[PDB]
């Protein structure tokens with residue numbers, strides 16, 4: 001683990017955690033909020049925390065992504081592999097509902113309830129920085 005970038009195939013954007021707790025995607029590589037440090041809390045779970053603001057990516061009960069200043073149960077995600085070798089992150093809390101981390105092709109975050117196994121918006125690829 002060294003800070004990475006979560007580049008999403010669908011749309012080709014980099015996961016971003018704006019200082020205001022807003023999660024989205026951007027194509028600007030020079031954006032100072034796309035560097036993320038992934039912290040493994042166990043064998044299949046991970047923490048996705050911003051290096052620039054320190055916020056942890058989390059997902060509320062409504063399936064919306066946000067930047068939390070605290071590592072709570074809503075910040076833990078299961079990292080899995082698609083058969084095309086892409087990383088997909090499903091909310092450990094909302095695991096049974098099948099809610100993943102995902103970005104609309106236009107760049108916006110896709111709502112938990114609006115994502116599902118197999119989509120292209122949930123296909124993330126861990127790109128290395130420096």
Ligand SMILES: O=C(O)[C@@H]1O[C@@H](O[C@H]2[C@H](O)[C@@H](NS(=O)(=O)O)[C@@H](O)O[C@@H]2COS(=O)(=O)O)[C@H](OS(=O)(=O)O)[C@@H](O)[C@@H]1O[C@H]1O[C@H](COS(=O)(=O)O)[C@@H](O[C@@H]2O[C@@H](C(=O)O)[C@@H](O[C@H]3O[C@H](COS(=O)(=O)O)[C@@H](O)[C@H](O)[C@H]3NS(=O)(=O)O)[C@H](O)[C@H]2OS(=O)(=O)O)[C@H](O)[C@H]1NS(=O)(=O)O
Pocket residue numbers: 010103104105106110118119120121122
């Ligand atoms: O079409 C895309 O732009 C694209 O679709 C997926 O990409 C596929 C490629 O196009 C495909 N190539 S091919 O040549 O077209 O075959 C192939 O390469 O595969 C890729 C990836 O898909 S695959 O690998 O899973 O097969 C891809 O989908 S996703 O990754 O799963 O999200 C996306 O990259 C992208 O999809 C995006 O746009 C479509 C089309 O939108 S449009 O351009 O605005 O028209 C979005 O889908 C449309 O809208 C949704 C929706 O809004 O929810 C669906 O609409 C129905 O359901 C809603 C919600 O209902 S419910 O939840 O309340 O029950 C209703 O409000 C709508 O009225 C419903 N319409 S109905 O079904 O006709 O009754 C529906 O999927 C679709 O509607 S429509 O037909 O366009 O009207 C899609 O969400 C969006 N994904 S996002 O990640 O960008 O957000």
